[PDB]
Design a protein around this ligand. Structure first.
Ligand SMILES: NC(=O)c1ccc[n+]([C@@H]2O[C@H](COP(=O)([O-])OP(=O)(O)OC[C@H]3O[C@@H](n4cnc5c(N)ncnc54)[C@H](O)[C@@H]3O)[C@@H](O)[C@H]2O)c1
Ligand SMILES: NC(=O)c1ccc[n+]([C@@H]2O[C@H](COP(=O)([O-])OP(=O)(O)OC[C@H]3O[C@@H](n4cnc5c(N)ncnc54)[C@H](O)[C@@H]3O)[C@@H](O)[C@H]2O)c1
Ligand SMILES: NC(=O)c1ccc[n+]([C@@H]2O[C@H](COP(=O)([O-])OP(=O)(O)OC[C@H]3O[C@@H](n4cnc5c(N)ncnc54)[C@H](O)[C@@H]3O)[C@@H](O)[C@H]2O)c1
Ligand SMILES: NC(=O)c1ccc[n+]([C@@H]2O[C@H](COP(=O)([O-])OP(=O)(O)OC[C@H]3O[C@@H](n4cnc5c(N)ncnc54)[C@H](O)[C@@H]3O)[C@@H](O)[C@H]2O)c1
Ligand SMILES: O=C([O-])C(=O)[O-]
Ligand SMILES: O=C([O-])C(=O)[O-]
Ligand SMILES: O=C([O-])C(=O)[O-]
Ligand SMILES: O=C([O-])C(=O)[O-]
Lengths: 315, 315, 315, 315
């Protein structure tokens, strides 16, 4: 009334799952945009039939034409590479995607600025905390209208693994991972709860040990690498996390979700994007929540931001 | 496969909303049982038509026959009075329902024992922490198969009021209210989080004050009384809370939900029911979670239990 | 984005269920407006807490102030009486509500015209086909922006009863009831299908007989009277039907739903509202579908319209 | 209570989407079984994290071990090839998959018979009407406990394309495609409705022409080939169709869904599987609905069955 138009800039693995989920949730019309000929049209056609099964009414079209960004309410950018040429799966590292994906963000930014400067933008392309700022710079959109995927996905993994040990509903575990989406992501032990209860109570009761949690933390950090080596760069959970973010915007849910956003002094950092809880509603990023980190937690945050900064200089 | 059978023992205000929600969620077949002639049949007929609008397939029938408890998978007991004769709305107090509702619990307990001893039982009738134990005693069901409504409802109010001030999604506020469902309910300030973050951070940031929270606590405790004086004994949110509990059981969600359950030493209390977080799944109460209360919080818990104990002696 | 504002003009039995369902479906902010003091505020407060259980974010407020119609995207009018003074339940007839409810529609129409002339209006108050046109006249809204409840509800009953006999999913039965919502509602036997198959195939196979269908038709026509005599004027299924209609508008689903709408020559009738399939989407009534009735079916349609016309002259 | 166990025998493109949708809908625990090492474990891990985003509690595990079929409530067989070696995309034909997939069905059948003879089986592997009977023969399961995917998917395409022309909600178009899932699928023009109304009324009103419908029929038959040539063998809509079928079984919805099932005289055919409306509920195929085809429609049905029969002799 009128339906949202959601343009998926990138129609690869994450793009495909997002289109599926958008139709399931009847969230809006979908454009699967890609530079690859034919493929987005095929995925769009396949996906469009699910309107019947889902009792939805969302158009799904493919596109190779950047001007289809015109009219977009939400733009989700997954365009780019998941691996660097010559690198084995064992040495997979998001940092190595920087020289492959940087020029793509600049190009897409220019098209967003021309065609849909008032759209809400979600950047996914890795290394995401670098790429989101690059796209912010070139798209010209306001700081409250662009975020990067990271924390919703990283914490989904931490929350899930803890829930398996404790035999509780996965979403009843809450947790914070901040700073950057990469190997220096900051897993804040102090900010884990189970049914709203400090995780430390469960540790005290010997229901999960500190050593078990350490292993879960390592597993969380290395989850993408683990999945890359088993199969592929992850896509199902990334897509679900992105759609949770987009839905909070579209429906004005005002969920607290950890995303990469422009810092303007929070944690002692400015002029850079980093992962922190934000509130997503109809006005985009309605609030940037600054966790009251202690000095040791802040030092870990600084290590994460330093990686983003290092790569930004290489970009 | 086969569909759950859910018997609503009591087809009044809460019963009606529960039947509506069960059909919306396609949770199982419903029996609206009541002692009142004709009424449950009328409500059942009205409600049954919503299967079409909801794309569900749940039978909804009315009953005046206790033997319809046979085959029940879940029994929800709302049977009883919401007010005592002669009392004004201003002096409404759940304690005064004790002499009206006690004999009803005994009667229903006998029918559950005969007809559906393996059912999962949710007791709602006030004063609920007294009534749930009375029904436990007379139904003979295992301790893991019977709970009382309280904390999900009480905390829904606290969570909601805080969310309104902070402009976040209501369910992103988490909170614990324990001990008893009544005027001595224990609102645990230390156990409030917003997006998994200690509420104290928001207080420190002057986004909500300690004085504002005090007023919200008072409002939470007095919410039922407020609604009684505006309209009626509450029913929509009670129904939704009950269905959240029943659904966690039926679908094995293993949600952490605060309910009245048999204490066997937790908080220093035995041989009594009280409100505490529990995990609800396919095996009923799968875990009783004991909050690691400090001495001052425990003293408040003791005050709540003392009220339940006092009335149990009067019953 | 921004959330729809849905004003329920009338906060009685149907109003209450609608508010509940709106929060369940997260459809928009809700105002429960009524002339009765305190009651709508109490219902609103109770209902608002269900945002937590439902993972929704819809405001629910009560109102006695007509100016709260300002800003409404959807207005649902249930204001008025369900029974006439002095009449027994056995002689309940929607026609007798005419002198009670006519002035109410005029009053509400004036307030809609002043405060929300661009809102989409759903009229429920009986006798609905008369009341909807009266409100159209006094509100001044376009013909595509106002409909009356009838056919979705009447057919939910027919569809449901047939589904019970045939042991199929209720919504897999499709059926048309047209003309007017009252005792001369036209049940079109030729337009019944089961899984898209003509009902006649099932009759031929002796899975349901013509005599059984006749009894189901009578039951359908007399369903409201049946429920009135068992309990009350129906409210759960009416609410669900209304919300199905409102949702199709709000989400641009373009569902085909039978509603009372202004006829401009369809079926040989003009200058009157009657029940017919329409398509509801973002532009309101996007299409009025005229069934290609045979002469005998049309004669029944004429009998229904004649009742609406007779009462319009009395109004 | 206890959760269903759903084993996906085949963890390729359709398997992946099914696992995603099962978690979205919280339908049961999932095993992604495949002969490929590592891949199913990677997909399972990725998918499992979506329990958090979806508020679900479904295990998702990978497997290379056939014995994990033990305990299965539902088994969905997508194992096998989507294309034949040496064939271009332009000459893609499901018939050519016969020599590649036949031995796979026999092998899987033996493992089902040993490990989960009481499971409900959905066969997807092409050519599906041949493969489903082969699996029936080797698994030994009852005729009411095994179906093949076809008609839900084929009709989703027809329904969708018509809905686009008529600007109505996709699922408000109903249609039947019977006989076989392949190039001789029978598109029954007489059995198309829109909002329960004969499509012929819309043709009479010049809202869609007979020539337009002919083009839509051709498009429907050739949809898989179209998607193969644009992208890949279809997977998103196949997955959604399969999950609609599985869900109707698991939740006892009793939906009418067109599937491949054992014919025992319907349409004059026995000892073969073919596509026809069936009712899916807790007892599996609860009803086989025989459309009362006219002689010309039956001749088309016979042509479809003849293809299945021809390939069965080659198998
Ligand atoms: N931030 C996160 O939490 C997170 C998580 C997972 C993956 N990722 C990243 O997301 C990105 C996409 O992952 P995927 O699995 O979907 O990859 P993919 O390779 O399957 O899809 C990427 C698509 O981008 C397309 N593309 C390239 N240039 C384009 C352009 N200019 N415009 C439109 N499309 C273009 C490619 O043709 C391809 O189809 C990768 O960079 C990956 O590393 C980020
Ligand atoms: N625990 C909680 O958080 C909570 C919250 C709200 C209300 N309540 C309590 O729930 C109860 C029901 O509230 P309501 O608003 O639905 O009340 P209600 O008066 O509308 O309905 C109660 C129904 O119980 C019926 N009844 C009486 N004896 C019966 C019997 N032996 N078997 C079956 N039915 C019988 C009555 O006829 C009536 O229809 C009250 O006791 C109320 O105080 C508890
Ligand atoms: N069209 C249909 O299919 C259909 C179906 C069922 C009921 N109905 C009709 O819907 C109407 C409402 O039914 P209900 O069960 O909700 O009745 P109800 O008596 O419970 O509620 C009606 C409410 O309207 C209020 N009211 C009176 N004047 C008002 C005004 N000027 N502004 C706002 N509110 C006002 C009353 O105070 C009352 O709370 C009745 O007329 C009933 O006959 C229509
Ligand atoms: N009936 C229908 O309407 C319909 C529609 C679309 C596709 N299909 C068919 O479904 C099948 C699967 O399609 P897809 O897109 O998922 O193909 P896919 O190639 O992506 O996946 C098939 C999987 O089967 C696996 N496999 C092979 N042998 C196996 C065995 N013995 N046990 C377990 N797994 C085994 C492969 O390793 C592969 O991962 C194909 O035969 C396709 O033609 C049917
Ligand atoms: O960035 C990624 O690839 C991830 O974490 O899924
Ligand atoms: O017990 C009650 O009445 C309540 O809190 O709603
Ligand atoms: O109009 C009514 O009262 C009904 O049909 O529910
Ligand atoms: O069988 C197929 O490949 C299809 O129709 O999607």
């Amino acid at each position: 009334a009128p339906k949202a138009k959601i343009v998926l800039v990138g129609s690869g693995m994450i793009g495909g799952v997002m289109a599926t989920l958008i139709v399931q949730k009847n969230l809006g019309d979908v454009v699967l945009f890609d530079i690859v000929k034919n493929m987005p049209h095929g995925k769009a056609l396949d996906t469009s039939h699910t309107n019947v099964m889902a009792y939805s009414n969302c158009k799904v079209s493919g596109s190779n034409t950047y001007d289809d960004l015109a009219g977009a309410d939400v733009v989700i950018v997954t365009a780019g590479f998941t691996k660097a040429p010559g690198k084995s799966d064992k040495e997979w590292n998001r940092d190595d995607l920087l020289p492959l994906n940087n020029k793509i963000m600049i190009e897409i930014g220019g098209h967003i600025k021309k065609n849909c400067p008032n759209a809400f933008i979600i950047v996914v392309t890795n290394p995401v905390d670098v790429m989101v700022q690059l796209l912010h710079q070139h798209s010209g959109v306001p700081k409250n209208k662009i975020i990067g995927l990271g924390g919703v996905l990283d914490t989904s993994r931490l929350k899930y693994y803890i829930s398996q040990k404790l035999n509780v509903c996965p979403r009843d575990v809450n947790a914070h991972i901040v700073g950057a989406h990469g190997n220096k992501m900051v897993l804040l032990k102090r900010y884990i709860t189970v049914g709203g209860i400090p995780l430390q109570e469960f540790i005290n009761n010997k229901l999960i040990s500190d050593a078990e949690l350490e292993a879960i933390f390592d597993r969380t950090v290395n989850t993408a690498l683990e999945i890359v080596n088993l199969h592929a760069s992850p896509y199902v959970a990334p897509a679900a996390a992105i759609i949770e973010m987009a839905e909070s915007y579209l429906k004005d849910l005002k969920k607290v979700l950890i995303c990469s956003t422009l810092l303007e002094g929070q944690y002692g950092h400015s002029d850079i994007f980093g992962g922190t809880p934000v509130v997503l509603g109809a006005n985009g990023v309605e609030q940037v929540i600054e966790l009251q980190l202690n000095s040791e937690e802040k030092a870990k945050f600084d290590e994460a931001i330093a990686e983003t900064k290092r790569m930004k200089a290489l970009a």
